Give the backbone structure.
Amino acid sequence: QVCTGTDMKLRLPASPETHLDMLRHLYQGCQVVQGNLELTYLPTNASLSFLQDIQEVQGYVLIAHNQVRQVPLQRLRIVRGTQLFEDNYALAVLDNGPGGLRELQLRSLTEILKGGVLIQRNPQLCYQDTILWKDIFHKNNQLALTLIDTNRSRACHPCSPMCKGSRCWGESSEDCQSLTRTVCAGGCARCKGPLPTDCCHEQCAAGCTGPKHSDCLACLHFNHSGICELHCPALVTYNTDTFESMPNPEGRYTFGASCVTACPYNYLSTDVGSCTLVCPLHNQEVTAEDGTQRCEKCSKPCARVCYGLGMEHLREVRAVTSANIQEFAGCKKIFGSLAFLPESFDGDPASNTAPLQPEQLQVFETLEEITGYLYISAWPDSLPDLSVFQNLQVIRGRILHNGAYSLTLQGLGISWLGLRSLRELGSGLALIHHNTHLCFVHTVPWDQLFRNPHQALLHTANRPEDECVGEGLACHQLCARGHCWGPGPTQCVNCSQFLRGQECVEECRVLQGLPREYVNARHCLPCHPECQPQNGSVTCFGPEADQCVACAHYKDPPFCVAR
Amino acid sequence: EKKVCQGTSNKLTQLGTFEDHFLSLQRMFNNCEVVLGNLEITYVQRNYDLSFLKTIQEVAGYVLIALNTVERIPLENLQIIRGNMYYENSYALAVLSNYDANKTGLKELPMRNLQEILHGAVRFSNNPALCNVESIQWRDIVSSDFLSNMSMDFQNHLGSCQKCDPSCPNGSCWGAGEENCQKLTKIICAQQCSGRCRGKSPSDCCHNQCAAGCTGPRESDCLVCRKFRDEATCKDTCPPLMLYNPTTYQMDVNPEGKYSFGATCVKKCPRNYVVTDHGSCVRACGADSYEMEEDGVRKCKKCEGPCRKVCNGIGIGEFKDSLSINATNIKHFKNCTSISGDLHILPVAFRGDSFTHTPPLDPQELDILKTVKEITGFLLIQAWPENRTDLHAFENLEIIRGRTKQHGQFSLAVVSLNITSLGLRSLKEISDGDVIISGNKNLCYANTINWKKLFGTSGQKTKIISNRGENSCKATGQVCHALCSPEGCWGPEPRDCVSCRNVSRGRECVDKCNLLEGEPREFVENSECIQCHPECLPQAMNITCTGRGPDNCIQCAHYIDGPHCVKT
Amino acid sequence: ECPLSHDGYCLHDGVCMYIEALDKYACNCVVGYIGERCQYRDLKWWE
Ligand SMILES: *[C@@H]1O[C@H](CO)[C@@H](O[C@@H]2O[C@H](CO)[C@@H](O)[C@H](O[C@@H]3O[C@H](CO)[C@@H](O)[C@H](O[C@H]4O[C@H](CO)[C@@H](O)[C@H](O)[C@@H]4O)[C@@H]3O)[C@H]2NC(C)=O)[C@H](O)[C@H]1NC(C)=O
Ligand SMILES: *[C@@H]1O[C@H](CO)[C@@H](O[C@@H]2O[C@H](CO)[C@@H](O)[C@H](O)[C@H]2NC(C)=O)[C@H](O)[C@H]1NC(C)=O
Ligand SMILES: *[C@@H]1O[C@H](CO)[C@@H](O)[C@H](O)[C@H]1NC(C)=O
Ligand SMILES: *[C@@H]1O[C@H](CO)[C@@H](O)[C@H](O)[C@H]1NC(C)=O
């Protein structure tokens, strides 16, 4: 029920046919949004049934350029606003508009911690100006920015007469806003009614149901096991009797705005019990042999480690050019992401930026792990696959392109992928669109690459089935269950036979063949060539030549040497 | 400024007569507010005054009022009882059998400002005459966790007691005068916050870490803290040094972050405590650790490999109740280098114990204490055999950190011994604590130590008096030493001067290491002439060895390999 | 006063006492010591 949220400020979607499908695969079943609740460029007849349970948004809520009649966010409870759209805005409803937003229907929304409201350029909405925004806002941001559109170009009905105050979001009777701040008495921050007895706990944020702290509507700082307060229980208990430190059994790990038992994959844990995406300085990401990772303190120098895009060394640049190709010299783990923009292969005059070459990508050969996303939008006509990323093992995806994607391919001349050793896609999605030559798009085992239920392939506008059957675009039968990458037999992810040099072969040359190879549990490896070939028997057993029953020329006690 | 009061751990023990114990109680608890130990009020007679108990504000242990005779114990300004130490494993406030043969003991106990007890319970027993204590409800004081084990009784018979104050709710008054009733802060209070409060208003209750009420919703207007005490405020956890930064995405300096030294948060740990990565001043680190300094201050890191053995010492860990080292626990100190605790050499180990059924300590086992090197806490030596002349069991005692101190002040106490010289040949630094040498019979060489260059922490005295006398070691059997500095000498043997001026070869000091008329030739290095390379031929009235290495000689012994003097 | 099961329980010539008001076994130290079993010397003063 935890999703990471997108990062589309105002840009156009990369694929309009799979954008609603992207929101369906991500925002379904979410209740706590770690990032941003963004709804950009949604046309009419859009099934928005995946939005009926989102409650907590840690960043801003954007509804931009949409043509839907209504946005069902009636269960939206709290907008924390840790990341804001503009400098001082947290609820931005822009440029929506027969189309256009009819009613907002934000019933349970009664708390915004940081940020303001920007409702602008929406000539289909009625009740954006009659909402008391001081009831929703916190005490610290009472002087917030409350820019509300005035022109509506549609005269509609007033509010429902069953509730007083004329504070309604739409036309329904159960839709009008209940005051939680301007109805309280004394110094109550949030309350249910005007009585001082019905005031809420000081750690409740969006109201409460009872006076206790375990039944808030939304909580202010940190939640664990239904109990929420300011300070999260850490893993270190400091006993002030004999002045000692103890591991706390009841300490929970800080995850976003909550405290969980163990925070999931692609969230690196620290010593203070506050897991997040990246670790600070003097810390190395190590593996705790359990599928998860937990960075601790490193040694004394800790000088050099490989960084990438979206990090300390590279902030403003978006693509990999020849200026930042020396920094990836032979590193096996890029901290950050990789993006190949179409401007990276273009020569810009008066800038001394040389375009890339196909012989320059061989520095990415020893790459095995990417902590961010992999974005490719331009590819030369030299080689039609991704053999320069063939040793890439895992893509973590802690930094995502547009907050949603971790493996993006935009308009390439690629025909088969060729990502052989790719075995784990951590976070995000996988978008493939407008590739008119890529046939092998559904033969990849994407379900074996996934680790979260919010992950799915989004493919469109690729090479169809009719151009892949008559043209012979189908690999060998060695790839088990159709899990295939390219037409060669060397790119099966899991074949039921042995391996001769990262290539699935049918039968090892043990009883036959001019060289002799020994049999591994999954591989098939060549041993020393001067072992005597046994005509109809098991010849070789190990890499050292002493384990042969007979050798060629000389018999010495260590091994068999030719001279 | 909340002056530190040490407390007493001498439960139900009369110290001498009644007058001597009363003078010790008046001398111990004179003008002290926060009691880190235990408030034990025992054996106070009728015609005495207890005004010095008016200044005690809070106690960090149990409060044991037992076997008294005075009619009034003014514990008026006592605010909170922490209850860190338990009396009967669940009890903190124990008033136990305060009655004479006339059954007229403690008539009233005016605990006016007492509003909350965190840990422990309340036990009242055998109080015939006791006014305005039976009407006090204890649901306001004792929390809901430790409410089950408490029990009390009241038998008022022929006490001639008057009426409580009707101007206070629920009839609960501590005394008999005006505004002498219980300032209850729990039940006439809204349940809209889990902390305390000051009135019946719902939106006017205290902070979560403000225990025993407050004077406002801000954490500065607060009487006492609950877990940690920040400067004039109360916090649950004062923040570390380097937090996150949303701008530079790196580590940022502290706006208000400090360390954690016990109940308070200070800016810097002392030089002997271990600075952990979480920013808390600790005495001992974790069980899988390695105490080693990184940059000046002492730290602990995760040890690799075997991580063989650490010694808990006396007082903490497994040996918390054992009061001295003896013939039973010394076998755990065999392969031990760093004492992470205390060391008590008491006369119970040499006389034998009939209660705990332990054999007497073999005096030859004290050489096992030769193996250890340092003490984090304190050293209390009150026993030594009559035949051995010097304390040679602590020859390799390098540093005493003084983390745990005897009565909160003393760190090195070699008292009531039969020694003629201390013999601490490697004691070079005492990081914390006071040093007393007193009560000894024939121990000189004590005023010629000059302890001011031994400790580095300022504000520390020493107490050396009535040991031997300056005119007693005047004879030829006792002298400090010649040829060395008068800074310090530990014994009559020449290996006992602290700072030798001329020659400091090993542990001993001599006339001179001979560069002209000696077969070993030792080059001077930092006023410590040590033996040079053994394959160097001694010269005739010349400088033989210049420095450390085979390339510092003129004529080699056997063979010449360039500048080196090699055997083969 | 106290029986032979608590003989030697108290140190430094402090006499054993039996408090019948609480059914406890206690010490009476000589002038100069401190503790539960009269096991510590008062270090804040002489000797
Ligand atoms: C010599 O050194 C001995 C240490 O090795 C030391 O022995 C200790 O004597 C103490 C005297 O009371 C004991 O408290 C201490 O630990 C005890 O071990 C018992 C083993 O069964 C436990 O049953 C016992 O538990 C309870 O004991 C009493 C009962 O009233 C409580 O007061 C106590 O709090 C606890 O609830 C306790 O754990 C013991 N240690 C060892 C390791 O044996 C001996 O006294 C020394 N002799 C001297 C100084 O003369
Ligand atoms: C605080 O955390 C608790 C614990 O997870 C939340 O309780 C869950 O609420 C959802 C509502 O959709 C239920 O489906 C779960 O079954 C609940 N879990 C448990 C263990 O009860 C709670 O919603 C969080 N927020 C607040 C404001 O209390
Ligand atoms: C207690 O302290 C006060 C402080 O002035 C002093 O006058 C008094 O003599 C002290 N009493 C004892 C017994 O030390
Ligand atoms: C005191 O109450 C606790 C409940 O927390 C219980 O576990 C314990 O047995 C009780 N008795 C004691 C400490 O003697």
